[PDB]
Structure formats: structure tokens, C-alpha cells
Design a binder for this molecule. Structure first.
Ligand SMILES: Cc1cc2nc3c(=O)[nH]c(=O)nc-3n(C[C@H](O)[C@H](O)[C@H](O)COP(=O)(O)OP(=O)(O)OC[C@H]3O[C@@H](n4cnc5c(N)ncnc54)[C@H](O)[C@@H]3O)c2cc1C
Ligand SMILES: Cc1cc2nc3c(=O)[nH]c(=O)nc-3n(C[C@H](O)[C@H](O)[C@H](O)COP(=O)(O)OP(=O)(O)OC[C@H]3O[C@@H](n4cnc5c(N)ncnc54)[C@H](O)[C@@H]3O)c2cc1C
Ligand SMILES: NC(=O)c1ccc[n+]([C@@H]2O[C@H](COP(=O)([O-])OP(=O)(O)OC[C@H]3O[C@@H](n4cnc5c(N)ncnc54)[C@H](OP(=O)(O)O)[C@@H]3O)[C@@H](O)[C@H]2O)c1
Ligand SMILES: NC(=O)c1ccc[n+]([C@@H]2O[C@H](COP(=O)([O-])OP(=O)(O)OC[C@H]3O[C@@H](n4cnc5c(N)ncnc54)[C@H](OP(=O)(O)O)[C@@H]3O)[C@@H](O)[C@H]2O)c1
Ligand code: NA
Lengths: 529, 529
């Protein structure tokens, strides 16, 4: 007889809804552990200026509670970090979840006991409890990447990763430097150029950024949206990427040069990274002719905007448009400002970080009061491998993830009975809240089943999992996504395996795969009583 | 009994070698019908300034006569049109072939009479003759495409297609205009910019041109090449594209950026269109990420050379590097001259041709003395589809080619008994002479076999042909070539079917496939005593 029915790890979007479901709806006893000092997860950690959603606010939220969709307000098209935080803090005070969420508690070890068939969770602070069910909502983009750059630790000013932005730091009138030009880096670069006396951008790989289309929301348009929320969420759940725009059905090279130029320009004026890739034509990520047309359109726009053509040439990427889409309000325009200088790490690689700044290969000491690490995450498996996470035959999860990280259906693991993952390996690549919802609801159903039927263990088969890798491998190889050398296939981090880490079939097909398995008596599961 | 054993149509490289093989080597009665007034096909028609090979002279010749290799000399690395026409004139002289090449004579009707089992062939000149074997060497690029641009024929000065260049025209000190920036257009533009008082180029689609590396040959090097000709042709016949360079075996993205940059720079300084696509890395035409790296290198070379950054942008293409590789001596450089100007039909299309010049959408009248259409050909199936060519059940060859043009082994057609094609549909995409040699010799053997064994019909099965189409389709769709929109898939002429028309497995595999069919008792052929 364990201490709790269930233990959830992480207080991000994932963990929060998982607790609400297991305790309020299933009536079970639950506790959540979160290493951070606050609920909110990603929207707790990333306090950096510019930090905001690249999903539009209207569908970057929960949907399960129709009363909360009516009530809660948003003033801007994209949600700033503080606003996404207040939203989640409100969700916590609403379902009365705060009392069962223990903060400032990292989970160091989680061991499955083959004999008692319970999980024992072990904390940083050297406490343990037991639960029948473990749920790991650790986050795809939770565990900080800070590369071992020669001299890093010598830097005498403030050095921080964006995922540990201090509440207290004010870059106003300081010399700021940033390493990274992904979603985080770019959206910091905008907000930062407005603040810093001078901003140096350390860019190794330029990316195909499009406009966000950000600005205020008419309170009338918010009202109209709330009226038609039932309908918006039905469209979101049937889409692939679930960003709340209608996805194009049209092959990009099935129409004239003029039409292809008009469609891309329309998407450009409207804004959104995911609209540009999927809202324009159906085959930008699958067909290379189509991918070149879209990249070409963005290359041409960078030249129009970026005045100094040198700065244009450095900002212009030449590789496949197959990284996750970026959007910002005025990224390229930012580089027309006289306090912003662009250092291409292709051409002038960082030799060493000194106390005083950053020395590049050309011999220039770039003096900085503040060095920002916009260098992304150990994505997907990060906080799993760094847990002492032990299932059947006393084996660590690492032993299973030799040829890359794996799962059955994105939510369960072979030889890890009663362990569910929110956004585990080989799950959906989408707007994250409705993918979380599909997973948190599917997991709640399976647990509730075990409770009612008195099942001691639920666990997928080695076969099911192997079969699910092959399904994800088939889908991923039909896309241009594997050939983009970014975090999505784990090529971003020295000595990490270039492996498939996502089901790229979309929320529509993913929800259908969950539904089919559940209706089919939980196909590929072993249910012991 | 027929008038002739065999009729050959066309007197280019194709027809000339076929006639040698059938008459000199097999003693048969044979006549050639060339609709042009001289031998040489492509090299008779294309009389324009700058008209030269883009395969290096050393292997843009016949290989069957080891003596003719030792003797005939070449002074330049690439052969000018007069020099290739002089070469085929020497071949015609050498084997006493002129007396069986009837010139100015266009065949309009090719009818298989199933009762007599002979070919009846009608000229425009009003002769009909019967033959046992018909060999159609009509050429992949013999039928001029002259787009119906509004008000074409209203033009006061001299209008010609490049394939219809008249021997009389001197463009020296004249305002010259040209439409098309293909292999023909570009090599014209180079030679023309020297001669014309002013050259206006009407470019719809810029292409990825590399340096030729053309110049004098060291007469020592010509003799050294001759020494090792046995050895060179062996590499040519075992290669894929057969341009006389060692094809690479290195996947482009399996090595550093630094290494990738050296390899492309190496191939640039050495030169050649096909060297840059296949001499650099093994997956430039198959792997989109490799293709990007290749295209990106050329885009940055157009930036270095083209001083006027406006011109450079218009010259810089953005589609896939998946058209037939172009190379020239100093193509991009040519635009640095004062007497040359680029008009992008993407931005300012032709509204109308007028007596004086050419009016673009911007309302500018481009005053011209000479208009040159470098607008290419009805490729592969041009002079077939335009012929009254009926086989079994009286069917026209267009009933066969509704979903695109077809063949068995590139050299025969289902329902067309005793018809053979030199570079028929679904044939090799290679340096042309050694592909013609593979086919002319394979055809001589099968015709020789029919003569000895007293066969009345040789003929592929619908199945065999349908199997070949599937083989050709499986090989193509595994490349970037289909997503090009050039002449190689009939997508150059409005209305014509976007179809496969080439085996892209290379000379090596094509020769192996001919050999395999022959040695296996002509697999998929019906032989009738
Ligand atoms: C600036 C920014 C903007 C984004 N915008 C979007 C967007 O617009 N659309 C979109 O789809 N996605 C977006 N994302 C991705 C984002 O990660 C998800 O939208 C979502 O926040 C993930 O929620 P989660 O609960 O799955 O993970 P997280 O929010 O990362 O929650 C994981 C939590 O678990 C904790 N944890 C991990 N390991 C342990 C352990 N061993 N013990 C205890 N606690 C642990 C972590 O500290 C963290 O608090 C954005 C991310 C960032 C950084
Ligand atoms: C390295 C290389 C360089 C090349 N350079 C060029 C170049 O600079 N310019 C260029 O244009 N091509 C060029 N080509 C393509 C060229 O067409 C081939 O290399 C080759 O010369 C074609 O020979 P052929 O006998 O197959 O066809 P062709 O030489 O075209 O001969 C076909 C002949 O058939 C005749 N014919 C067609 N229909 C009929 C009919 N109904 N009745 C009677 N006669 C008919 C035509 O009039 C023509 O004379 C090049 C190819 C390679 C490999
Ligand atoms: N915001 C959210 O966060 C997610 C991830 O975006 P992100 O911006 O945080 O990270 P990211 O997409 O992983 O981008 C990291 C950036 O840092 C650079 N970088 C990484 N390691 C480096 C090193 N050792 N030296 C120099 N540069 C280095 C990368 O360049 P390279 O691409 O060349 O590694 C890249 O530009 C997005 O999906 C979005 O939803
Ligand atoms: N030289 C030999 O000749 C072969 C073929 O080369 P080629 O140059 O003769 O032909 P090609 O490769 O077909 O080139 C034709 C050129 O004409 C242009 N064009 C065609 N129709 C046009 C129209 N209606 N209006 C404006 N421009 C038009 C094409 O632009 P688009 O790409 O837009 O059609 C292209 O630039 C090569 O394989 C080589 O061996
Ligand atoms: Na969508």
C-alpha cells in the first residue's frame, strides 16, 4: 500500500493538467514535484526580455474547461512570458492545485520495485515516497544546454542561459552579447537591442525567420473568438500542427510563379512561422522544389529589409527550410540599428571567452558586461537520462535508449510499468497545449481503467515500442525535417545520437492512434491483475 | 520483298553510325533521309556564334574506330560547331556514306503494313519506299520550339530560332535581343556580347552555370590522351554520364563545410557542368541538403563576379540545381560589359513583339535589329509525334503516348515491329556519342540476328515496355530531376505531358541492361521466323 496513488514530476502545462485529472476527476491521491521555485515550467524559467509564445494566444492555452475559455482575457496577439505565467498560476488557484504541488524539489531517482510493483521517488533533499503510478512531464525543452566554450568560466560579468534569466538583471545601458539565433535568441535580440548600449549577436547558423504579426487584440475580436471556441478547437484537434489556422491542401508547384509569390506574401503580411510552412502550401516540408520556393521568398525579403548587404549575406541562410519555423516582430529590421553588430561564427569562430568579453578568431576582443547563452536544450530525453530512472530487471532508461530515445505512442515505455510520459520521445510535433491534453486525457483513462479493474501493472511490449519507432521512422524519412541539423533530431549537442525523436504525422493522426489503441483493448499493452 | 533492307531517318551522330553498321559491316541495302540540306544534324542546324560542345572534345567523338582516334586532331578543350560539323563530314567521307544520305528530304509517313510486314515511308517530296527495318535517329533536340508570343511575326528585322541560325547573318554592330538562358542561350550570349553593338537578354529563368575551363589544348596532352584512349573509353563506358571524369563516391554532407567548399572550388577552377554535379559529390542530384550546398556555392560565385548587385540578384537562380548542367567561358562576367543588359521576364514579362523591338509589362520598348529565340526544342518525342507514325492495329504512336512517350530499352516500341530508335524515349542521359554507340551496335546485332535466322518481325511485348516505364519511373522519382520544370519532362512547352522520358541509371547500367536482354535470348522480344 503506497504513500500516494500517483506521483507527477514537473509543474509546466503538462504536470498541472495531469494533477487536475488524477486528483479532481479520478478522486485519487496525488503529489507533483517541481525542481523550480514556481509552477509554470517554461514560463517560470524564461524571464528574459522578449520571451513570448510563437503560437497565437487564442490557442496557446487549455480547452478542457469551457468556463475558463469564456472568462480568461488576453490583450495581445502573442502572449508575453509574465502573461502565460499568470494564466497558469490562475489555473493552479482555480482547481485548488497549489496545496499538492511541492516546489524547490528536484527528483534525483525514481525506481520501480518488481516485488511490490510500486514506484519509489527520491528527492534532492533525501526524502522518498511511494506511488502506484509515475507521470514524467519533464518537458521537451526543459534541460539547459550550455556548451563547454573555451574560457566560459573566466567571464567576470553576468553569464546566464536564457532558461535561468534572473528576475533582477537589467541590461539597460550595458554591453550585451548573445550566443544563439533560434526562436529564443531571435526574440531576445529584438527586445534586447531596444535596451543594451550595444548588442553583439554570435550567430553560427542563420534561420528562415518570418514576421509574427504581433500587436494588440481588439477586445471585440477576443469576444468573437470566445463565441466560436467550440469550432476553433475542433479545427485545432483535426489539424496537423494545431496553430488554429486552416492548413493548405495545395501543392506549391501546381500553380504559377505569380500565385506562389502572392500566397507566400499573404502569409508574410498575416504572420506566423507555422502559417508560412503549412498555411501557404501542403508540401513545403516534404517536396524540395516547394521548400526552395519558400526559402527563396524569405532570402529575397532579408535583402529588401537588411540595409548593409554584408549583414544581409550573414543573416541569409542557404541550407534547407526544415528547422522549426521562427517568427518575431521585426527581427531583420533590428540589424539596421547602429547599436547592433552581427558576428558570423562560420567566418570568425569564438577562440576564447576572457574575463572582459569574447575573443573571436579575427583577434577582436568583443567587450561585454552581460553574456547570454541562447544555446537551446538537451531536448526530449534531457531530464530522463539525467534521472536515475530504473524499471524492470533493475535497468536504467539509458540501457533502452542506445540507438536513440524511444516510447510506445509517445506516452509509455517498454519495461517501465505504470510510468506515463507527457511529451515523451516519439510524440507529436505541434502547438504543445492540445498535444499535452490528448496525452493527459489518454493517460487518465488508462490509470482510471487500472483503478476500476484492479490492475497492478500496465506496460507496453518491446514489440509495440519497436513497431512505433518504425512508424515514426517511416513518417520522418518522408519529410525534409531529418536534413536540418537542429535540436529536433538531437544533432545540436556534441556526442548525442542523430535519431528520430518525434511522430511527425500531426495531432489529427496522433489522437486517432491513441483512440484506436484504447478502443482496441489497449493494443500492444500487457494488463496484469 | 522491300525496296531497302533498312531506312535510317536523321544524318546526325545517330543516323551516320547506324548507316555505317548496316551497310559497310552487314552488307544490307540502306538509305538515310535528312530533312536538313547537309550531314551533322545538331551541328548542321546550330550554325550560331558560340555554338560549341559542353562535353570536352577528347570524348565528344566516336570510339569504335581505334585508327580514327589516333588520327583526327582537336586544338581546343571544347569543340566549336564548325569543328564538330567538319568531324562528322570526315566520318561521312571516311566510310563512303554520302551516296546513301538523301538531303532536304523530310519523311512525313511511317506506316507498318501488317500483311507484307514491311515499313512504307512517305517523304514530303512524294516518294514512298518499303523497308524491312526502320531506324529512327530523329534526335532528342532536333524540333525547334518557337513560342506563339503575341505579335511575333510583326517584327521588322531578323527573327530566328538558334537551331534555325542562317549562315548569312552577321550580328556585328547591331542591336541584338535573345529569349532563353539555357545551354544554347548562354553560350550565344558570351559570343554575341563581343560582336553586338548592344545585347538585350530576355531571361525568364536563370540557371546554375559553372565555368567550362575552355582554352587551347597542349598538343603534347592531345597525344598523351590518344596514348591512353583504350583506358579513357573504358572509364567512359563504366561511368553514368560518361564525360571522361572519375565520378565521386562521397556523400556531400558526410564531410565538413571547409571540405565541401574546397571540393566545389576545385571543380569550379577545373570547370565542366557535369563535373560540378557528379565530379564533386555522389548525391547532388538525389539529396536535397547536398543540392542546397551545391546551389549555394554557385549563388555566392554570381555575387563575387557580377558587379551590379541588381543584375547579380536577377542572374542568381533560386529553384533546384536539377536542370541539365550548363557551363560557359565567362558567362556571368559577360554582364559586367556596357553593351549588355538583363531583363527579368519574372518581373517585366513581354507584353507584345512590335516591328521595331519588344515591349515589356513596364511599358519599355526594347529596339532590336535581330531577335534570337534560344527557346529550345520539342525534346525526345518531338519529330515522332509530328510524324504520321502508325504500327499494329493501324494505331498512331500518340495513342501509345497519352501518359507520356514510351519504349522498351530506349531502342524499340510495342506495336512497332522492326522499328528501332537512336535515343528513343526512356534512353540514357549521358555524353551523347557513347550512348549512340551502345544503341547503334546493340541494334546492328539484333538486325544481324534477324537476317541469319530469317526472322520477319522483331518486336517488344506491351508488358516488357510497361515494365521499362516502371523501371525508368522508379529510378527517376528517386532523383531531384523530376522537380526541375525543364525540357527533360516535357514541361517546357505548354500542354505537353509532365512525364518521364529518360533512363537515369547511367551508361554503365544501360549497357549492362542491353547485354542482359541479348544474352537472355532477347527477354521481352517476340521473334517470328
Ligand atoms: C520562450 C518559449 C516560448 C514557447 N512558445 C511556444 C509556443 O508558442 N507554442 C508551442 O507549442 N510551444 C512553445 N514553447 C515550447 C514549450 O516548452 C511548451 O509550449 C510548453 O511550455 C511545455 O510544457 P511542459 O509542461 O511539457 O514542459 P515544461 O514547461 O518545460 O515543464 C517541465 C518542468 O519539469 C521540471 N523538471 C524536469 N526535470 C525534473 C526533475 N527531475 N525533478 C523535478 N522537476 C523536474 C522542470 O524544471 C520544468 O519546470 C515555448 C518555449 C519557450 C522557452
Ligand atoms: C557534350 C554534348 C554537347 C552538346 N552540345 C550541343 C550543342 O552545342 N548544341 C545543341 O544543339 N545540341 C548539343 N548537344 C545535343 C546533341 O543533339 C547530341 O549530342 C547529338 O549531337 C545528337 O545527335 P543525334 O544523331 O542523336 O541527333 P541530331 O544530331 O539532332 O540528328 C537528328 C536529325 O534527324 C533529322 N530529322 C528529324 N526528323 C526527321 C524527319 N521526319 N525526316 C528526316 N529527317 C528528320 C533532323 O533534321 C536532324 O538532322 C550536345 C550533347 C552533348 C552530349
Ligand atoms: N522558444 C522555444 O524554444 C525552442 C528551442 O529554441 P532555442 O532558441 O531555445 O534553441 P535552439 O533552437 O536549439 O537554438 C540554439 C541556437 O544556439 C546556437 N548554438 C548552440 N550551441 C552553440 C555553440 N556551442 N556555439 C555557438 N552557437 C551555438 C545554435 O546554432 P546552431 O544551429 O549552429 O547549433 C542556434 O542558433 C523552440 O522550439 C521554441 O518553441
Ligand atoms: N546546347 C544543348 O541544347 C540542349 C537544350 O538547350 P536549349 O538552350 O536549346 O534549350 P532549353 O534548355 O529548353 O532552354 C530554353 C530557354 O528558353 C526559355 N523559354 C522557353 N520558352 C519561353 C517563352 N515562351 N518565353 C520566354 N522564355 C522562354 C527557357 O526559360 P524557362 O526555363 O522559363 O522555360 C529557357 O531559358 C542542352 O541539353 C544542350 O546539350
Ligand atoms: Na493548424
Amino acid at each position: 500500500t503506497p504513500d500516494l496513488d500517483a506521483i507527477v514530476i514537473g509543474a509546466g502545462f503538462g504536470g498541472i493538467y495531469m494533477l487536475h485529472k488524477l486528483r479532481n476527476d479520478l478522486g485519487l491521491s496525488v503529489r507533483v514535484f517541481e525542481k523550480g521555485g514556481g509552477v509554470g515550467g517554461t514560463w517560470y524559467w524564461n524571464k528574459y526580455p522578449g520571451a513570448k509564445s510563437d503560437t497565437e494566444g487564442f490557442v496557446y492555452r487549455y480547452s478542457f474547461d469551457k468556463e475558463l475559455l469564456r472568462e480568461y482575457d488576453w490583450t495581445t496577439r502573442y502572449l508575453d512570458q509574465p502573461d502565460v505565467l499568470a494564466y497558469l498560476e490562475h489555473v493552479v488557484e482555480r482547481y485548488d492545485l497549489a496545496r499538492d504541488i511541492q516546489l524547490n524539489t528536484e527528483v534525483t531517482d525514481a525506481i520501480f520495485d518488481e516485488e511490490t510493483e510500486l514506484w519509489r521517488v527520491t528527492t534532492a533533499g533525501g526524502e522518498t515516497l511511494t506511488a502506484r503510478f509515475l507521470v514524467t512531464a519533464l518537458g521537451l525543452l526543459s534541460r539547459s544546454n550550455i556548451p563547454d566554450i573555451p574560457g566560459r568560466d573566466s567571464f567576470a560579468g553576468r553569464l546566464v542561459h536564457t532558461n535561468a534569466w534572473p528576475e533582477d538583471l537589467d541590461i539597460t545601458g550595458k554591453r550585451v552579447g548573445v550566443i544563439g539565433t533560434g526562436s529564443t535568441g531571435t526574440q531576445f535580440i529584438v527586445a534586447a537591442a531596444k535596451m543594451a548600449e550595444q548588442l553583439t549577436v554570435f550567430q553560427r547558423t542563420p534561420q528562415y525567420c518570418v514576421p509574427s504579426g504581433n500587436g494588440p487584440m481588439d477586445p471585440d475580436e477576443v469576444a468573437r473568438i470566445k463565441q466560436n471556441f467550440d469550432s476553433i478547437w475542433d479545427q485545432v484537434r483535426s489539424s496537423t500542427v494545431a496553430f488554429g489556422f486552416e492548413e493548405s491542401t495545395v501543392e506549391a508547384m501546381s500553380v504559377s510563379e505569380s500565385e506562389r509569390q502572392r500566397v507566400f506574401q499573404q502569409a508574410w503580411d498575416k504572420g506566423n512561422g507555422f502559417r508560412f510552412m503549412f498555411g501557404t502550401f501542403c508540401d513545403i516540408a516534404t517536396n524540395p522544389e516547394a521548400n526552395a520556393a519558400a526559402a527563396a521568398f524569405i532570402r529575397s525579403k532579408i535583402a529588401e529589409i537588411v540595409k548593409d548587404p554584408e549583414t544581409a549575406r550573414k543573416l541569409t541562410p542557404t541550407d534547407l527550410y526544415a528547422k522549426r519555423p521562427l517568427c518575431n516582430e521585426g527581427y531583420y529590421e533590428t540589424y539596421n540599428r547602429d547599436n547592433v553588430s552581427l558576428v558570423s561564427l562560420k567566418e570568425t569562430p569564438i577562440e576564447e571567452i576572457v574575463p572582459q568579453g569574447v575573443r573571436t578568431s579575427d583577434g577582436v576582443v568583443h567587450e561585454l558586461d552581460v553574456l547570454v547563452f541562447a544555446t537551446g536544450f538537451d531536448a526530449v530525453d534531457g531530464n530522463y537520462r539525467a534521472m536515475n530512472l530504473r524499471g524492470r530487471d533493475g535497468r536504467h532508461i539509458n540501457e533502452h535508449w542506445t540507438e536513440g530515445p524511444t516510447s510506445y505512442l509517445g506516452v509509455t515505455k517498454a519495461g517501465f510499468p505504470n510510468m506515463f510520459m507527457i511529451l515523451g520521445p516519439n510524440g507529436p510535433f505541434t502547438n504543445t497545449p492540445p498535444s499535452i491534453e490528448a496525452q493527459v486525457e489518454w493517460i487518465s483513462d488508462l490509470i482510471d481503467k487500472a483503478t476500476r479493474e484492479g490492475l497492478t501493472t500496465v506496460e507496453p511490449t518491446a514489440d509495440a515500442e519497436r513497431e512505433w519507432t518504425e512508424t515514426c521512422a517511416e513518417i520522418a524519412n518522408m519529410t525534409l525535417f531529418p536534413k536540418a541539423d537542429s535540436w529536433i533530431f538531437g544533432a545540436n549537442i556534441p556526442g548525442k545520437r542523430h535519431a528520430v525523436m518525434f511522430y511527425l504525422g500531426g495531432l489529427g493522426n496522433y489522437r486517432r492512434q491513441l483512440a484506436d489503441v484504447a478502443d482496441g483493448g489497449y493494443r500492444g499493452f500487457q494488463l496484469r491483475g
